[PDB]
Design a protein around this ligand. Structure first.
Ligand code: SF4
Lengths: 261, 1138, 261, 261
DNA sequence: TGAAAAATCTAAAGCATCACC
DNA sequence: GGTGATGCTTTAGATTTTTT
């Protein structure tokens, strides 16, 4: 017998809104530490880790390590149905092939319990170790999404630099090109707009800008983002989701092998 | 062309004529002959005057051959105003002295003259020249100014319009003198001053055998490109002469010598050989050319030799010190063809392309060999033979001589009698007939028939650009209604399974009320047998009444169906015969009023409508005036490179029309938000039934001649069977020759009859009327639609065709009957009842009653009769019929089905084994296997279970891995071969996939594959570069057999991956796209038709489309719906008024 | 000669956009007691009832009963021009086949009269019988619209059941099934947003949500709506509008055929 | 060294989005008095004349009359792609064929620069004349956009007639016909809801609505739109870009010369 | 000899979302 | 809390090649 409750259920709707397009199939993992998800995307180029600990749910009960069989594009249709102020109370019996989540209105007049059947699958699990990275930028989430949409409109690829004067987002396409400079902001102490960059050494590395703008749609779940980037290392696009969890992104860099040399 | 060059040209062709068994007849004497070739040359007469003529080449029955020159002064007709013929004729006589020789007034019947039936003729002026270039000179002098003057509506302006300028010279001789190929002649000669006379002989008809040749080219090449005429060498020419084979081989490339070997595919065929090995290529070419000199043929044959053999050998003769013209006689003409002054060139590909009625993608060889000859020649792909020529030459020699014998017997068995049956009626040379399309063949027949009726020939019409329909709206399409080709329902219909039916008792009452009349009509019209002497009429009427009543009393049954093909053979010619349509007879009311036969109560008019479809710009007329006025003061780039500035007024019609159309299209695509508007309106026009009948008379003559020749072919075929049952060589040879002659004339008449309808719609035709094709197609649509209304009432139709209906009928419905007849010649009579039913329907519906003909021209008395040859002939009950289904709503697959013979073989199969473009070789074997194994089964569920089981083989092999079975044939199991004609550079604008894999292979071996054209384009689609479209994941198999380190490096570089270590070919391939392709095939063939006919999924591994899935969920659910019409009581009905 | 005038032009826009999607050709029945519409859809599943009494209009007069047939899609298409506030005037003539729409500015600056030429048609008109309905429930239009759009994403069948605690909205499909229970609101200060139920006999009966979604877009007509059903009878959904009249839709049920056993 | 800094970037983005679907490519003439745009569209019937004066720019520095030929689509997607509240600046080289743009945020946080190529083209600058127009009307942009989208939505052609009572817009079509008349007001001290009429000589002429919609797509550029017409002279849809420039439009009369029937 | 099956570009229309009175 | 307006998604229509 497993169940959970959430006072602000809009975060689950928002994370499903983010994940409905990057991932089509992913096997949820339910443990006593909380809920976590480890899977590889549709194009097998990026693997996402989700983690919401036990304190995020005000009422959490998980007597055994059990895994769901959810497909994401299906229940993303039925999770978007709630309002922005509803209450989500998920439930799942252990021997059941189907979990039922019950909805509660903000002023307590109605209940909307929906159950979604699951197919049981098995996907390999890998644990990426933690490593100290050369650069970590405290870029606002809104500005990061804006600059991703800006650069993706010209070309298909972007190179990221972290020089001593700031970070450099430049993209070059067949039609135009340009570079964007984000100077450090220390005159304002508020972290919602100011940027502070961890400075070790400048790194030049190319990422798939189309896919970056593809999963930048997760923007409103966190107020600010941190781009952790090292040489020949997949970048860690971190979102501090609400105030209890995190959203781990790993996109593998691409290296061009031109025939000139 | 200067005369000071054409004189030695004619001397050179006279010399070549002398050295190939031909000799110009000089001794005055009468000798029999056989016309085989016409050639317009120059013949200097006895008074040193340049004179154009023709060269009638003949052969004889003893082997000796000759030629005769006929000097006939060419001409064309011009038409001038009334009362001014003699003045313009005298002015032309005194203005072109030395060019114009004879001019006179000649009355000829114009075909479009107003009020022309009672005997009005327009006086014409015919002028004659000496040489063809003088025709060209005077034509280019007079034509453009006068045609601009006439279309605008010194004394050359009094003329109006000239005719038959486009008629070639040899066609003009063959018309005026009635000299057709493949006829026996008696040629008489007196001297140079006396003109030579030629007469036709008909008391014997037996065709001689001209000396024939047929050679094929096999060549190597640098790997994966189109072979060239400078990099590789010819090594084996294999050629056939009169059933005896000779092979000449270059010993430098092949390994050792070659010995004689018999090559017989079947006991009918003979493949004897006397091979010959030569040291070097120069000696091979010299020996082949000298052996051609020794044999001296008039006819010879290549299979695609215009574009593959002769340019190659001509180039190599030119490079290696020779010139191809002065030793054999074949050269390139301005039209890109290879004609000889002394020899006729045959290309079997043109015949297969035009007349063999094969699927389009089976036009290449081995297909006309497995379809027409009956055997599969031994083959190997051109990549392997380059390496094969090094070690053993047995397989290479076998392939080359197999290609040679296939070409030779393909020509001799089928192409030769067919083409020499066309030439008896077509007034053109045999290579001229086989070269170009059916349009000019029909044009030549209407030419000769119009000349016997003394009718002027209309000019090839100007293709009028930017025509305005009513309120401007210039058109980019001027089309009639398309053919009604559909597929009413999908699935299986076997003659053993029970099937659903839905009778209408009113239809059976209607059919019951008139059984006697239908049998009257069937006995009286179908076989021309009077009915008053049949004895068992009451018995068969009682039988059909019993069957019809016993089927009527229960109008809802589930019984075994009988598949029929209710089609009308030669349907469109039958329409044009019954309705009596001629392309210059149908006249609008603006001229019938001026006709003096416009009398009330007469029957000169027959009204038939048609659906005209017109697609045009939405810009009104004023927009067109504004845009032509604004396009008056601008510059254009020159048509030629490095040219000067071009204004608008001096531009030609074509380029200015194209540019103005582009400007209107660009103005439209942004302003009026609708680029194209398709409008269908009903148009009704009047077809005059009182006309000088040459067209419909010609069609009637060919239909009667076809039936006559079918009868003589049948009687000579039973003579042939008796002859092979008795066994005497001379009489079996004679009867075989006559049987082949009659069969070839039958096929020739059938092909011409089929092509009359297709000719008239073609652009530029002399007798052009789009109303023709519209009216005939719409009348055919009306007949087909009334037929399918009746078949919908009585049973169910299955497929809609331009001239055929497929249907299933209950087995208790009557099929055929037998009659006892007192006639000694015809004692047994059989009539199929559905044929009689459709025949009486079309007899009460579509019989013409205004069908009028001439009786005698003196008294103008016209006999009004009534004819209707529109006949639903029927086919026997087929075993099964298959209709595969489409994947989308609204659009149903057109002409994609399969019909099975009674014995279990293939009756017809269309739309599937066409291979029109390059295919994957992954769905063809699947569909062949399912069609072959499909018959076994009892019910609907059992036959779908069997076809699902045989499909599980391919689904398990493709969906799982290759597994235990070997990997040798897997590469060609998926590989798709593609090729291009032009270079890689000029295709660089587009991306596509073919040039993409060309560039992918260019980075592997080198840029040498860029500088050429036509290379290998293997399409093993890769998997691990995911996200990228298929256009970038196209890799070839050239890297699989290369060096190991090289293929490791290139597999790491190409597919943007470095960490992966598996480089096996059994992991690179993308199984998902292959499974998508095979699954799309199985949705088309099996699964969707299974779900349409109330049967669950035959195989569970394929997912239905969303529309069919939701249809099945809403159907299978016990909750259908309710309405409001029966849930609430209807009040009443009132209508809104003014 | 026919004259009409609405003090609020928004209600005519709302009724045109409510009846836009369901039918294509309508038949106005114009009477001195009021104007009514009894047109029938092409699928023969739903019928539209419309009532607009004379006393709601500022000026209204009818010389005799008039029956004119308009293309209702183009009617809503031309009425979408008019603003949410402008005064709408309807003008007709017994000797003319053209209906006129005069729009009046709030501050007397602009006039906009439009002429629409009508056409004849042959449609069915069906008499509706009056029966007492077993279960009656009123419900705010916003949350019922939310419920309908919510259950449209689950499947194509909705089950309307009336239990002791209130009304229950079921919906099955390929994605499992989903239920929405509602309770009784008694201690509420305002009945405009409240729900109340009365019973005669519980009953379960299914409907297709395509036409129900077509009815859903009449929500802006008023904040309240009442739906009622009984044994083998359609719904009556009363979107009564500011005492001008009301608007009703009738949707075919289906009897519960045997499938459980 | 062509430099042009302007403290607002919204007006340039608006006036460039004006030429989105109207002119695909044009010549950008630079002179000491400012920048001009004379260009014929793809259909060669309407005209555009944009002038942005030098004094209106915050800082401006040009050295020699230089003409560019950049296509409007590329620069328009570049400029609309970036931000709107920021400050724009121009940068060019004497012999290069590439413009440069500078987007400096007002809060001194980020800078954003793009630079794109062009194509060389030197079409003749048409010497259009200026004539005294028969009537002049000034009306707000919003209601003019409303009526133009109206009459393109309901018909195809409009007859614009000006008299003492105001201006009328009579549009017909296959669906019906109607007109919109506006009356001048003077008691309103603000021009946001006031219209003015200059009455010299009445004139009636027929235009096309697709081009009017294409022009009036530029509605956020100015709060007022002024129109002027004559017997055969095209319209002048003059705009007032703040107090910095003006953007005109022209439409040739729709001659019809129809049969008298 | 073409001309239409299939892929690919492309713009119109509906929908949830965003800021303001 | 509604409402004009807009980026996003979908979906039907225009375009383009080849078959040697
Ligand atoms: S249709 Fe009658 S009136 Fe017209 S040309 Fe023929 S015979 Fe004369």
């Amino acid at each position: 017998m497993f169940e959970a409750r959430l006072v602000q259920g809009s975060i689950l709707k928002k994370v499903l809104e983010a994940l409905k397009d990057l991932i089509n199939e992913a096997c949820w993992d339910i443990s006593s530490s909380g809920v976590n998800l480890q899977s590889m995307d549709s194009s097998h180029v990026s693997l996402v880790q989700l983690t919401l600990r036990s304190e995020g749910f005000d009422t959490y009960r998980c007597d055994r390590n059990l895994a769901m069989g959810v497909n994401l594009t299906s229940m993303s249709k039925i999770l978007k149905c709630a309002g922005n102020e509803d209450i989500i109370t998920l439930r799942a019996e252990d021997n059941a092939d189907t979990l039922a989540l019950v909805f509660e209105a903000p002023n307590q007049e109605k209940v909307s319990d929906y159950e979604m059947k699951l197919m049981d699958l098995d996907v390999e699990q890998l644990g990426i170790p933690e490593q100290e990275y050369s650069c970590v930028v405290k870029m606002p989430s809104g500005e990061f999404a804006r600059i991703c949409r800006d650069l993706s409109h010209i070309g298909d690829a972007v190179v990221i630099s972290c020089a001593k004067d700031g970070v450099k987002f430049s993209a070059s396409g067949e039609l135009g090109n340009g570079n964007i400079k984000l100077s450090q902001t220390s005159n304002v102490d508020k972290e919602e707009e100011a940027v502070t960059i961890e400075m070790n050494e400048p790194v030049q590395l190319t990422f798939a800008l189309r896919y970056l703008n593809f999963f930048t749609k997760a923007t409103p779940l966190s107020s600010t983002v941190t781009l952790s980037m090292s040489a020949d290392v997949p970048l860690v696009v971190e979102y501090k989701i609400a105030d209890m969890g995190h959203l781990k992104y790993y996109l593998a860099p691409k290296i061009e092998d031109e025939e000139g040399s | 062309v200067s005369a000071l060059k054409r004189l030695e040209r004619s001397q050179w062709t006279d010399k070549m004529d002398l050295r190939f068994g031909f000799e110009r007849l000089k001794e005055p004497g009468e000798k029999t002959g056989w016309l085989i070739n016409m050639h317009p040359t120059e013949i200097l007469d006895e008074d040193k005057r340049l004179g154009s003529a023709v060269d009638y080449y003949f052969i004889q029955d003893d082997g000796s051959r000759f030629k005769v020159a006929l000097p006939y002064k060419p001409y064309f007709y011009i038409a001038t105003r009334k009362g001014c013929e003699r003045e313009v004729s005298s002015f032309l006589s005194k203005k072109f002295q030395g060019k114009i020789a004879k001019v006179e007034t000649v009355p000829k019947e114009d075909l479009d003259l107003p009020n022309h039936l009672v005997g009005l003729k327009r006086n014409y002026i015919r002028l004659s020249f000496h040489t063809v270039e003088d025709l060209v000179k005077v034509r280019k002098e007079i034509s453009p100014a006068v045609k601009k003057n006439r279309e605008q509506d010194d004394q050359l302006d009094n003329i109006v319009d000239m005719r038959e300028y486009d008629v070639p010279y040899h066609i003009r001789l063959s018309i005026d003198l009635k000299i057709h190929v493949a006829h026996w002649y008696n040629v008489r000669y007196r001297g140079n001053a006396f003109p030579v006379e030629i007469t036709r002989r008909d008391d014997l008809v037996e065709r001689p055998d001209p000396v024939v040749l047929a050679f094929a080219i096999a060549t190597t090449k640098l790997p994966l490109k189109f072979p060239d005429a400078e990099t590789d060498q010819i090594m084996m020419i294999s050629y056939m002469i009169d059933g005896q084979g000779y092979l000449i081989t270059n010993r430098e490339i092949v390994s050792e010598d070659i010995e004689d070997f018999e090559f017989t595919p079947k006991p009918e065929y003979e493949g004897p050989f006397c091979v010959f090995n030569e040291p070097d290529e120069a000696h091979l070419i010299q020996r082949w050319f000298e052996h051609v000199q020794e044999t001296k043929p008039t006819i010879m044959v290549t299979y695609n030799g215009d574009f593959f053999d002769w340019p190659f050998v001509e180039a190599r003769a030119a490079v290696h010190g020779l010139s191809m013209q002065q030793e054999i006689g074949f050269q390139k003409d301005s039209q890109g063809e290879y004609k000889a002054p002394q020899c006729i060139h045959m290309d079997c590909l043109r015949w297969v392309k035009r007349d063999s009625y094969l699927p389009v993608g089976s036009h290449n060889l081995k297909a006309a060999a497995k379809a027409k000859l009956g055997y599969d020649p031994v083959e190997l792909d051109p990549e392997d033979m380059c390496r094969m020529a090094t070690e053993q030459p047995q397989t290479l020699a076998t392939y080359s001589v197999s290609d040679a014998v296939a070409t030779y017997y393909l020509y001799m068995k089928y192409v030769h009698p067919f083409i020499f049956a066309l030439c008896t009626i077509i007034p053109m040379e045999p290579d001229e007939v086989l070269r170009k399309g059916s349009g000019t063949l029909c044009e030549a027949l209407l030419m000769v028939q119009a000349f016997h009726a003394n009718i002027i020939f209309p000019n090839k019409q100007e293709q009028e650009f930017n025509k305005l329909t009513d309120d401007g709206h210039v058109l980019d399409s001027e089309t009639y209604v398309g053919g009604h080709v559909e597929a009413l329902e999908s699935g299986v219909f076997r003659s053993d399974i029970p099937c659903r039916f839905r009778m209408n008792p009113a239809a059976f009452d209607f059919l019951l009320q008139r059984v006697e009349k239908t049998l009257r009509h069937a006995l009286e019209e179908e076989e021309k047998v009077p009915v008053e002497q049949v004895t068992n009429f009451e018995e068969v009427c009682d039988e059909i009444k019993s069957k019809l009543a016993s089927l009527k009393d229960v109008p809802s049954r589930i019984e075994c169906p009988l598949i029929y093909h209710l089609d009308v053979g030669a349907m469109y010619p039958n329409i044009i015969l019954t309705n009596r349509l001629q392309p210059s007879a149908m006249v609008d009311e603006a001229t019938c009023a001026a006709c003096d036969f416009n009398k009330p109560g007469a029957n000169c008019q027959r009204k038939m409508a048609w659906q005209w479809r017109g697609e045009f710009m939405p810009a009104s007329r004023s927009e067109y005036h504004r845009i032509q006025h604004q396009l008056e003061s601008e510059k254009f780039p020159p048509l030629f490179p490095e040219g000067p500035a071009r204004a608008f007024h001096e531009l030609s019609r074509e380029e200015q029309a194209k540019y103005e159309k582009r400007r209107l299209a660009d103005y439209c695509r942004k302003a009026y938000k609708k680029i194209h508007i398709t409008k269908v309106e009903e148009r009704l026009t009047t077809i005059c039934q009182r006309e000088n009948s040459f067209y419909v008379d010609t069609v009637r003559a060919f239909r009667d001649r076809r039936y006559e020749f079918k009868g003589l072919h049948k009687v000579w075929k039973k003579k042939l069977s008796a002859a092979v049952e008795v066994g005497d060589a001379a009489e079996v040879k004679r009867c075989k020759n006559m049987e082949v002659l009659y069969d070839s004339l039958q096929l020739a008449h059938k092909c011409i009859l089929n092509s009359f309808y297709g000719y008239v719609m073609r652009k530029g035709a002399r007798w052009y009327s789009m109303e023709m094709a519209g009216i005939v197609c719409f009348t055919g649509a009306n007949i087909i639609t009334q037929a399918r209304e009746l078949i919908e009432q009585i049973g169910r139709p299955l497929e809609l065709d331009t001239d055929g209906i497929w249907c299933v009928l209950p087995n208790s419905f009557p099929e055929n009957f037998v009659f006892k007849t007192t006639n000694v010649k015809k004692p047994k009579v059989t009539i199929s009842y559905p044929g009689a039913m459709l025949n009486i329907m079309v007899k009460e519906g579509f019989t013409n009653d205004q069908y009028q003909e001439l009786a005698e021209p003196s008294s103008l008395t016209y006999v009004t009769r009534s004819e209707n040859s529109i006949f639903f002939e029927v086919d026997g009950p087929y075993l099964a019929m298959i209709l595969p289904a489409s994947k989308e709503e609204g659009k149903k697959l057109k002409k994609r089905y399969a019909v099975f013979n009674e014995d279990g073989s293939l009756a017809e199969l269309k739309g599937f084994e066409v291979k029109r473009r390059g295919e994957l070789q992954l769905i063809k074997i699947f569909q062949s296997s399912v069609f072959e194994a499909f018959l076994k089964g009892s019910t609907l569920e059992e036959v779908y279970g069997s076809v699902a089981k045989v499909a599980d083989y391919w689904l398990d092999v493709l969906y799982s891995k290759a597994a235990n079975m070997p990997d040798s044939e897997l590469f060609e199991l998926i590989s798709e071969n593609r090729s291009m004609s032009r270079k890689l550079e000029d295709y660089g604008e587009q991306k596509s996939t073919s040039i993409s894999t060309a560039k992918r292979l260019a980075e592997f071996l080198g840029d040498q594959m860029v500088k050429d054209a036509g290379l290998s384009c293997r399409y093993i689609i890769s998997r691990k570069p995911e996200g990228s479209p298929v256009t970038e994941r196209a890799i070839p198999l050239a890297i699989f057999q290369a060096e190991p380190t090289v293929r490791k490096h290139f597999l790491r570089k190409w597919l943007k991956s470095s960490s992966l270590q598996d480089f096996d070919i059994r992991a690179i391939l993308d199984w998902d796209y292959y499974i998508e392709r095979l699954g799309s095939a199985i949705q088309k063939i099996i699964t969707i038709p299974a779900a349409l006919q109330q049967v669950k999924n035959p195989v569970p591994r394929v997912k239905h489309p969303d529309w069919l899935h939701k249809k099945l969920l809403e159907k299978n659910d016990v909750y259908k719906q309710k309405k409001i019409s029966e849930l609430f009581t209807l009040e009443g009905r009132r209508q809104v008024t003014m």
